[PDB]
Write a protein that binds this ligand. Sequence first.
Ligand SMILES: *[C@@H]1O[C@H](CO)[C@@H](O[C@@H]2O[C@H](CO)[C@@H](O[C@@H]3O[C@H](CO)[C@@H](O)[C@H](O[C@H]4O[C@H](CO)[C@@H](O)[C@H](O)[C@@H]4O)[C@@H]3O)[C@H](O)[C@H]2NC(C)=O)[C@H](O)[C@H]1NC(C)=O
Ligand SMILES: *[C@@H]1O[C@H](CO)[C@@H](O[C@@H]2O[C@H](CO)[C@@H](O[C@@H]3O[C@H](CO)[C@@H](O)[C@H](O[C@H]4O[C@H](CO)[C@@H](O)[C@H](O)[C@@H]4O)[C@@H]3O)[C@H](O)[C@H]2NC(C)=O)[C@H](O)[C@H]1NC(C)=O
Ligand SMILES: *[C@@H]1O[C@H](CO)[C@@H](O[C@@H]2O[C@H](CO)[C@@H](O[C@@H]3O[C@H](CO)[C@@H](O)[C@H](O)[C@@H]3O)[C@H](O)[C@H]2NC(C)=O)[C@H](O)[C@H]1NC(C)=O
Ligand SMILES: *[C@@H]1O[C@H](CO)[C@@H](O[C@@H]2O[C@H](CO)[C@@H](O[C@@H]3O[C@H](CO)[C@@H](O)[C@H](O)[C@@H]3O)[C@H](O)[C@H]2NC(C)=O)[C@H](O)[C@H]1NC(C)=O
Ligand SMILES: *[C@@H]1O[C@H](CO)[C@@H](O[C@@H]2O[C@H](CO)[C@@H](O[C@@H]3O[C@H](CO)[C@@H](O)[C@H](O)[C@@H]3O)[C@H](O)[C@H]2NC(C)=O)[C@H](O)[C@H]1NC(C)=O
Ligand SMILES: *[C@@H]1O[C@H](CO)[C@@H](O[C@@H]2O[C@H](CO)[C@@H](O[C@@H]3O[C@H](CO)[C@@H](O)[C@H](O)[C@@H]3O)[C@H](O)[C@H]2NC(C)=O)[C@H](O)[C@H]1NC(C)=O
Ligand SMILES: *[C@@H]1O[C@H](CO)[C@@H](O[C@@H]2O[C@H](CO)[C@@H](O[C@@H]3O[C@H](CO)[C@@H](O)[C@H](O)[C@@H]3O)[C@H](O)[C@H]2NC(C)=O)[C@H](O)[C@H]1NC(C)=O
Ligand SMILES: *[C@@H]1O[C@H](CO)[C@@H](O[C@@H]2O[C@H](CO)[C@@H](O[C@@H]3O[C@H](CO)[C@@H](O)[C@H](O)[C@@H]3O)[C@H](O)[C@H]2NC(C)=O)[C@H](O)[C@H]1NC(C)=O
Ligand SMILES: *[C@@H]1O[C@H](CO)[C@@H](O[C@@H]2O[C@H](CO)[C@@H](O)[C@H](O)[C@H]2NC(C)=O)[C@H](O)[C@H]1NC(C)=O
Ligand SMILES: *[C@@H]1O[C@H](CO)[C@@H](O[C@@H]2O[C@H](CO)[C@@H](O)[C@H](O)[C@H]2NC(C)=O)[C@H](O)[C@H]1NC(C)=O
Ligand SMILES: *[C@@H]1O[C@H](CO)[C@@H](O[C@@H]2O[C@H](CO)[C@@H](O)[C@H](O)[C@H]2NC(C)=O)[C@H](O)[C@H]1NC(C)=O
Ligand SMILES: *[C@@H]1O[C@H](CO)[C@@H](O[C@@H]2O[C@H](CO)[C@@H](O)[C@H](O)[C@H]2NC(C)=O)[C@H](O)[C@H]1NC(C)=O
Ligand SMILES: *[C@@H]1O[C@H](CO)[C@@H](O[C@@H]2O[C@H](CO)[C@@H](O)[C@H](O)[C@H]2NC(C)=O)[C@H](O)[C@H]1NC(C)=O
Ligand SMILES: *[C@@H]1O[C@H](CO)[C@@H](O[C@@H]2O[C@H](CO)[C@@H](O)[C@H](O)[C@H]2NC(C)=O)[C@H](O)[C@H]1NC(C)=O
Ligand SMILES: O=C(O)CC[C@H](CP(=O)(O)O)C(=O)O
Ligand SMILES: O=C(O)CC[C@H](CP(=O)(O)O)C(=O)O
Ligand SMILES: [Ca+2]
Ligand SMILES: [Ca+2]
Ligand SMILES: [Cl-]
Ligand SMILES: [Cl-]
Ligand SMILES: [Zn+2]
Ligand SMILES: [Zn+2]
Ligand SMILES: [Zn+2]
Ligand SMILES: [Zn+2]
Lengths: 693, 693
Amino acid sequence: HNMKAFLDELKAENIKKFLYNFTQIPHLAGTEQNFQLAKQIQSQWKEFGLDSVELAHYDVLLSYPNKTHPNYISIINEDGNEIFNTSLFEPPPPGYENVSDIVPPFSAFSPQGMPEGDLVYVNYARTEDFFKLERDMKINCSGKIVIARYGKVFRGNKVKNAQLAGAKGVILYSDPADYFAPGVKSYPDGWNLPGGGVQRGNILNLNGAGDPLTPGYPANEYAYRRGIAEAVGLPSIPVHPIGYYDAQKLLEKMGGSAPPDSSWRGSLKVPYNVGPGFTGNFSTQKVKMHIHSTNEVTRIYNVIGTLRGAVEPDRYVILGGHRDSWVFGGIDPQSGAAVVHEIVRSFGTLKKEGWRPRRTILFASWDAEEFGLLGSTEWAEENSRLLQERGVAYINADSSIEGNYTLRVDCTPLMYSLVHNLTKELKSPDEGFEGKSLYESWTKKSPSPEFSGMPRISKLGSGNDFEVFFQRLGIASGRARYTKNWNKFSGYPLYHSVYETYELVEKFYDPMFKYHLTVAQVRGGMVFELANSIVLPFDCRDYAVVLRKYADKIYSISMKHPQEMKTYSVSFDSLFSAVKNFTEIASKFSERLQDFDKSNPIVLRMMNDQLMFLERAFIDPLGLPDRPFYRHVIYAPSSHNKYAGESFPGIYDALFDIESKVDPSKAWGEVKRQIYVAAFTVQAAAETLSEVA
Amino acid sequence: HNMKAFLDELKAENIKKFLYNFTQIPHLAGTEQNFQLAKQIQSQWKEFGLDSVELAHYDVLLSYPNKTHPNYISIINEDGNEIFNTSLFEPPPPGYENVSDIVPPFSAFSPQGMPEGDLVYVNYARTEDFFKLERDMKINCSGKIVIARYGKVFRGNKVKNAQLAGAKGVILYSDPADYFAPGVKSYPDGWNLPGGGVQRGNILNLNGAGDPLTPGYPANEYAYRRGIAEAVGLPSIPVHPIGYYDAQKLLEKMGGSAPPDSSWRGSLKVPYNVGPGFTGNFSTQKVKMHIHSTNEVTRIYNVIGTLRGAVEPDRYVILGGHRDSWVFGGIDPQSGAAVVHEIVRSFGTLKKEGWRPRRTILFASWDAEEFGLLGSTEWAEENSRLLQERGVAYINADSSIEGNYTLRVDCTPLMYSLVHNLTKELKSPDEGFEGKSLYESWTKKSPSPEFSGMPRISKLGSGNDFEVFFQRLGIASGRARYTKNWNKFSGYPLYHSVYETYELVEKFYDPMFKYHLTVAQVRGGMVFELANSIVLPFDCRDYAVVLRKYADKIYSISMKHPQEMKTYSVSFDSLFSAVKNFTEIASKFSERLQDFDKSNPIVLRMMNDQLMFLERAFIDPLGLPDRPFYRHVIYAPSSHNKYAGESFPGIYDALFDIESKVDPSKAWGEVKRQIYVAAFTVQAAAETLSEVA
RNA sequence: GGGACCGAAAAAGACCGACCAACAAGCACGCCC
RNA sequence: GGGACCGAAAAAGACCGACCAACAAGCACGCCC
Ligand SMILES: *[C@@H]1O[C@H](CO)[C@@H](O[C@@H]2O[C@H](CO)[C@@H](O[C@@H]3O[C@H](CO)[C@@H](O)[C@H](O[C@H]4O[C@H](CO)[C@@H](O)[C@H](O)[C@@H]4O)[C@@H]3O)[C@H](O)[C@H]2NC(C)=O)[C@H](O)[C@H]1NC(C)=O
Ligand SMILES: *[C@@H]1O[C@H](CO)[C@@H](O[C@@H]2O[C@H](CO)[C@@H](O[C@@H]3O[C@H](CO)[C@@H](O)[C@H](O[C@H]4O[C@H](CO)[C@@H](O)[C@H](O)[C@@H]4O)[C@@H]3O)[C@H](O)[C@H]2NC(C)=O)[C@H](O)[C@H]1NC(C)=O
Ligand SMILES: *[C@@H]1O[C@H](CO)[C@@H](O[C@@H]2O[C@H](CO)[C@@H](O[C@@H]3O[C@H](CO)[C@@H](O)[C@H](O)[C@@H]3O)[C@H](O)[C@H]2NC(C)=O)[C@H](O)[C@H]1NC(C)=O
Ligand SMILES: *[C@@H]1O[C@H](CO)[C@@H](O[C@@H]2O[C@H](CO)[C@@H](O[C@@H]3O[C@H](CO)[C@@H](O)[C@H](O)[C@@H]3O)[C@H](O)[C@H]2NC(C)=O)[C@H](O)[C@H]1NC(C)=O
Ligand SMILES: *[C@@H]1O[C@H](CO)[C@@H](O[C@@H]2O[C@H](CO)[C@@H](O[C@@H]3O[C@H](CO)[C@@H](O)[C@H](O)[C@@H]3O)[C@H](O)[C@H]2NC(C)=O)[C@H](O)[C@H]1NC(C)=O
Ligand SMILES: *[C@@H]1O[C@H](CO)[C@@H](O[C@@H]2O[C@H](CO)[C@@H](O[C@@H]3O[C@H](CO)[C@@H](O)[C@H](O)[C@@H]3O)[C@H](O)[C@H]2NC(C)=O)[C@H](O)[C@H]1NC(C)=O
Ligand SMILES: *[C@@H]1O[C@H](CO)[C@@H](O[C@@H]2O[C@H](CO)[C@@H](O[C@@H]3O[C@H](CO)[C@@H](O)[C@H](O)[C@@H]3O)[C@H](O)[C@H]2NC(C)=O)[C@H](O)[C@H]1NC(C)=O
Ligand SMILES: *[C@@H]1O[C@H](CO)[C@@H](O[C@@H]2O[C@H](CO)[C@@H](O[C@@H]3O[C@H](CO)[C@@H](O)[C@H](O)[C@@H]3O)[C@H](O)[C@H]2NC(C)=O)[C@H](O)[C@H]1NC(C)=O
Ligand SMILES: *[C@@H]1O[C@H](CO)[C@@H](O[C@@H]2O[C@H](CO)[C@@H](O)[C@H](O)[C@H]2NC(C)=O)[C@H](O)[C@H]1NC(C)=O
Ligand SMILES: *[C@@H]1O[C@H](CO)[C@@H](O[C@@H]2O[C@H](CO)[C@@H](O)[C@H](O)[C@H]2NC(C)=O)[C@H](O)[C@H]1NC(C)=O
Ligand SMILES: *[C@@H]1O[C@H](CO)[C@@H](O[C@@H]2O[C@H](CO)[C@@H](O)[C@H](O)[C@H]2NC(C)=O)[C@H](O)[C@H]1NC(C)=O
Ligand SMILES: *[C@@H]1O[C@H](CO)[C@@H](O[C@@H]2O[C@H](CO)[C@@H](O)[C@H](O)[C@H]2NC(C)=O)[C@H](O)[C@H]1NC(C)=O
Ligand SMILES: *[C@@H]1O[C@H](CO)[C@@H](O[C@@H]2O[C@H](CO)[C@@H](O)[C@H](O)[C@H]2NC(C)=O)[C@H](O)[C@H]1NC(C)=O
Ligand SMILES: *[C@@H]1O[C@H](CO)[C@@H](O[C@@H]2O[C@H](CO)[C@@H](O)[C@H](O)[C@H]2NC(C)=O)[C@H](O)[C@H]1NC(C)=O
Ligand SMILES: O=C(O)CC[C@H](CP(=O)(O)O)C(=O)O
Ligand SMILES: O=C(O)CC[C@H](CP(=O)(O)O)C(=O)O
Ligand SMILES: [Ca+2]
Ligand SMILES: [Ca+2]
Ligand SMILES: [Cl-]
Ligand SMILES: [Cl-]
Ligand SMILES: [Zn+2]
Ligand SMILES: [Zn+2]
Ligand SMILES: [Zn+2]
Ligand SMILES: [Zn+2]
């Protein structure tokens, strides 16, 4: 087996060295330091033995705090005395006190503002938290500064929900409930967030546009850019993140209504009152934000490496992950970048020996991912036609670890059998599973709710570089990392903090680098099999199985309004019919895939094209309603949470909060249109697996 | 040569028989007679030896006059006496007096109405005729019934221009200037239009949508249909066509301003006054329209025949033309349908002998073409994914003859060398070119203004079934017919009339059926070479050459406003750069295409894919501004004339009547955006011919 | 035969830039003499 | 230890239709006894 040779070349010691190398200085997007690391990686990928390695540059809107006018929040009395100020920077950790160019905590793409007003606590600032605030508790965030805890949903959605509720400011904070694991110590004595720690992060609502100034087209030297006024997904109110020390100061004086229930209570010793404003004596004190961050068009650099295929060089398997970090990127993304580096070194050594993959492999070091997947998206916009004609698969390589418990896999159903087979051939690195397969340890620790005796594999939404490839271009996509046990949908405590260091990983997450090595074997083994298997390792029958579940589910969600379904003759008959047809046609294609002569290079290429193009058949060039860059009809991010994936997203969005809609007849009409589009698309996808003539 | 064998099987006597067979009763879209002819063709294509022949049906909006409430126009006095009525039907021709189910003259998809008002003569009802009316002559069509002569532009554009000018009715008539050739006799004694003859035809503005009720998706059994109120491209005022006898009655009494110049004067003995209203005594007489036509969802039937390829069955060459007619379709479309039938019979005989084409050939008998390319477009919407993945080329087969002078070819630059080579190997059927090539007779009678010693090949716009394939899906497309000498952009006198018969073709156009045979050799030979050549016969260097002409042209058109170009820094630098790059890359790809080993089936398929997908690279999924179904960045129909093709249509539309625009800065900004999109698209297309890895 | 207007890129055709660092503007077909 | 509110499909998980011709609704984790 040529794969074992590849897997056995992968070394935890190499991953450890590369991780150390990538995490000693910050590599913020648009800074000289990240350009220097780009050039280092280009130079090393050549040395490692790639056929070519180019820098692809774009000029994209980034966001930076003003160094000589810092961002801070104040409690301010009616005399205008700033009696309490939030931190200007995170207290640096041991052996990082002398490190310059650490960007202070800030919300990227915040507008400028000095708004002052009454504080309203809005929990996680989810759609349902504003439904609870405004519909149930009759509280009105209009003209108020909202304070929200990080977690559950993408922070950009929180800011969007806040804007729609009339807020003039958003304060984001990390609550210990969400970012402090019980009975482990603050950094540097453990992996928990200290009270001065702050999660940086962008607050855009791009819905897959990439660079806000150049939607649809690469941000090249001659690009026509939108005015900032019509730029895509910019927030319209100021936003700033703080730690829980600073957050306790703002929250302790809160008056107005008590929290409705336990779902609104964090772990600080404060009442978690909703407001608006402060209790009793303090009622005439306000909160005032001071945001002077600037948006500016800055050059970014993707590293693109090529290992040309010996047989099908016009078929591309892509292994891509970002290089840019908020500070050191100890986990996010250098734990992924270090795995990609060792995978390149290892494919490189096989190349020097005189081995080549069947299909071309592309390796990508993406830039400006933290600013909204900007490097991956601009490159895909530049190369969309080649990618749609030639793209076999995309394997993501962000953070390798967010925990040390078990494997977490999100991929297209086309990769389910590949992932099952591979993890059965890999050793588990898990305590008490010595001599067992990764499949067994994974299936045991994370069983599928959907499939008895199978491991959980989740849906792809967005919030990483795979998005343009999968959701816009319909290229089969996969990601795998090590994760914690499920506190849930919050992340890891030290996410986007200065405390996210080399030492955090080495001391607390993966001292042996065995989890890193297992993830390198999963990502690398998947790339290997996609690039080298004679018949592409995609099982169309796994798509058939999940399409029936998604159809059962979307019917079930519509059935929340079963009287309306009757009034407006809402039928899923066409959708169930299409799924039944896909199942039958996939079954017959599978017979032909087993039977045919794989020595016939022309019949092989035909059947490989049918497999490669199956994911493309789910792409609608018109896109989903009000989201033209989300074109996959089976999968899209939640409108309300970029991180979360929905099945039959067109129907799902049409159904969401439908009982609120003023014109029932039109709203249910849109539901029936989306059933039509979905049934048509499933039948069309099925027909690509039919006999070609 | 296997092609000669195919060409020598084609027989003029067979085409004559089939033409007779297809033109004895009307075959209007949606009628039992056209269903019967569909089934006949399905049955004969099987007998001829196709591997399979299916009927593909759709339920589309068609339009019919009410049989028991006829359409007519009246001159009406202030007492409300209808003193003059227009014809209720065309006087039938000799030997057609006893023929039932001849649809009376009507404008398909006219709304219902009995509007009464003053007549304004608006010439051809072109954009420039309303600019002349409203800007120069200060005449105001608001609330007036407009009368317009057929010709120059698609009648649907005339109705659109009229609606935008505030007209409440449109009367279309055939002026002898445009539809009566000097010194030839009216049917049946010649090929000229008699004074009772009327051109039927649809008046939609679909801009490539297909069925008005189901834009983007096939009109299948479970389709969600728009309300008639939001249906695509329906006219909002009543419209009716009349002959020149009836038109003289309406035009003779016209008062108001004289015609501005000779360009407004037809050939009737009337003054061609503009109005509004009638002269002197007659000023209080009005015109009143009576339209009771109904729109209704009707089943239509495409015939789809397959000849599976022996080597690349997943590569499709399509030969398609419509079957539906306004009445007998003596020319339009049965002169084309009869050529397709003989091409099928001939491919069929080769199949029986045991020959197969390398690539699959699809044969299509399209329905409801006269109602807006509805059959071709719904089928393409159903099969868009297969067509984009597998479609090599589309050859149209509407009317084979509109004249007996020379060849007329409109195709992608990718087919220029194929067409040159083929016409050099075919005999000219032309008087005084006995023993010469069709290339020589054609080049002589129709020299290229663009290329010394080359024949004219024009651009594809719309107004036929190739549109969805080329303008929406980016499949390389071609058409060839015999045409008149250039009276121009009017058609042939008996177009869409009851007088367009078998006898018209047999007596006056092509008694020997030698023009039909030459067109069958061109269409059939092109299909043959596309389906059978080892290397696809596309020369990318012909695209390079024309892209430089189009760039020179669009620069030239922008330079009408050269001061504004400076004020707003409008530069074509990027566009010229992209074209220079395409030229260089196409030149190198051409070297590699000549050098490589064609015995390597995998290197051949790679290079054939690069050629096949080159046309697809010009497709923008976002579509052109305000025209989402026109996605080709190099070619689109004129916004003002569906029949006419524009190069760099995005830039062209942005520049059109720019000096009228209230915000110069925004309008010129859109021009710069379209330069950007065009340069990006040309560079992207060029890069698909680069080495793949 | 001669003359007058026009034909707003499907230019119908032919041809023609440094006191906007080569791609505007400007000689067949169909009321007067 | 027991109890109470909540967790609005990434359902966290398990399980459960003819006086809307099988796919609503309805038993782990984080003030009172
Ligand atoms: C993941 O792993 C699963 C489990 O192994 C795997 O499924 C299996 O794939 C193999 C390989 O195609 C299947 O093998 C075949 O079985 C059928 C009978 O059911 C045989 O007809 C096939 O015939 C062979 O004979 C040819 C003679 O010309 C040989 O040259 C040729 O190589 C064939 O081996 C063949 O034996 C097997 O049936 C399945 N098993 C199951 C339970 O499905 C799957 O392919 C892997 N998936 C991915 C995406 O990697
Ligand atoms: C339309 O017609 C034109 C005019 O014929 C045609 O262009 C020609 O195509 C041929 C076929 O490819 C070209 O032939 C080649 O010329 C180059 C030298 O310039 C040679 O290197 C090529 O080599 C051959 O040697 C191989 C040995 O392994 C042979 O096996 C192989 O078959 C090759 O023949 C070859 O001779 C020719 O140069 C051009 N001529 C011109 C003027 O361009 C064009 O291909 C046709 N286009 C379409 C779309 O049909
Ligand atoms: C991460 O690792 C890379 C790769 O080893 C380090 O960069 C490299 O550092 C080496 C050794 O110091 C450099 O070699 C030297 O360069 C200097 C100046 O050009 C020269 O005078 C010396 O004689 C020696 O040859 C090398 O330039 C450089 N390699 C690359 C590809 O950039 C990098 O500094 C490490 N980073 C951290 C933070 O540890
Ligand atoms: C929170 O931060 C703000 C801003 O840094 C602090 O308020 C500021 O305090 C400075 C220094 O005392 C004030 O400046 C002074 O102004 C007078 C002239 O008017 C000058 O002569 C003094 O010598 C002094 O420099 C400034 O007015 C004031 N600004 C604002 C907007 O409040 C605030 O004190 C901090 N709060 C805490 C609790 O630390
Ligand atoms: C899945 O595959 C099946 C089987 O090929 C498809 O079934 C077909 O469904 C349509 C109805 O949607 C049937 O079409 C016709 O409808 C008219 C209605 O007036 C009727 O007159 C015709 O006789 C015919 O019934 C068609 O018969 C039926 N075919 C079979 C064999 O059942 C189905 O539509 C596919 N699903 C999707 C979503 O495409
Ligand atoms: C155009 O040509 C077609 C093909 O020849 C004509 O239709 C066909 O007419 C033949 C000869 O009349 C039919 O054969 C006969 O059918 C009847 C009734 O089914 C049967 O009783 C006779 O013994 C004889 O077999 C044949 O059905 C039919 N073929 C097809 C494929 O439709 C058609 O009528 C011609 N149309 C015109 C307007 O000339
Ligand atoms: C143009 O066509 C219209 C409609 O066919 C003609 O006008 C119509 O003429 C009929 C027959 O004379 C009129 O009907 C009559 O009505 C009275 C009762 O009111 C009845 O007793 C008579 O016996 C007669 O049938 C009808 O009113 C009238 N309709 C309209 C809308 O005008 C018109 O005469 C035709 N014009 C020419 C020049 O042929
Ligand atoms: C057609 O192909 C040429 C040749 O590869 C492409 O040329 C490249 O054009 C860009 C400018 O648009 C140059 O990029 C860079 O711009 C920054 C500006 O700050 C500058 O700092 C860099 O040094 C660099 O000049 C690039 O140098 C240039 N390459 C060459 C070899 O001339 C051209 O863009 C392609 N055309 C299109 C439309 O893609
Ligand atoms: C960062 O903040 C500083 C200080 O407020 C800004 O510097 C000022 O710039 C404007 C000129 O545009 C001047 O009016 C002020 O006098 C400047 N002040 C100082 C101390 O230099 C600076 O422009 C900001 N940087 C940005 C917006 O990028
Ligand atoms: C929530 O409070 C806001 C802010 O006071 C209300 O908006 C205003 O309502 C008045 C009366 O209709 C308008 O005339 C003002 O223009 C609004 N003020 C601002 C600053 O926008 C809002 O109506 C309240 N919403 C609810 C649902 O009670
Ligand atoms: C690495 O793995 C260890 C061992 O599983 C994790 O520590 C345990 O966490 C559980 C509950 O999640 C506690 O009940 C135990 O007290 C811990 N076990 C031991 C042996 O200490 C640790 O949390 C993991 N590290 C990270 C960063 O996730
Ligand atoms: C065609 O026109 C006739 C005559 O005007 C229409 O027939 C009428 O239909 C309505 C019922 O919808 C009745 O009110 C009238 O009494 C009918 N008249 C006659 C003589 O039958 C017919 O509906 C029209 N056809 C259409 C619209 O398709
Ligand atoms: C052309 O005539 C129409 C119709 O009379 C004019 O439109 C009307 O103008 C008045 C005065 O502004 C409006 O109040 C009416 O509502 C219009 N009437 C209708 C029936 O629409 C129109 O303004 C004239 N256009 C020009 C450019 O002179
Ligand atoms: C078929 O071809 C004939 C011969 O070219 C066409 O008739 C001539 O038309 C020219 C001008 O266009 C006249 O000057 C001659 O009087 C005609 N020649 C002869 C020999 O009569 C005829 O128009 C063509 N038929 C059609 C339908 O286009
Ligand atoms: O903007 C996005 O889509 C996500 C960016 C980034 C993803 P990462 O933190 O890099 O996993 C974030 O969540 O802040
Ligand atoms: O609607 C169209 O695009 C054109 C239909 C038809 C084309 P044809 O007459 O069939 O050439 C017409 O012009 O009326
Ligand atoms: Ca972009
Ligand atoms: Ca449609
Ligand atoms: Cl990842
Ligand atoms: Cl045609
Ligand atoms: Zn990341
Ligand atoms: Zn991140
Ligand atoms: Zn036609
Ligand atoms: Zn027609």
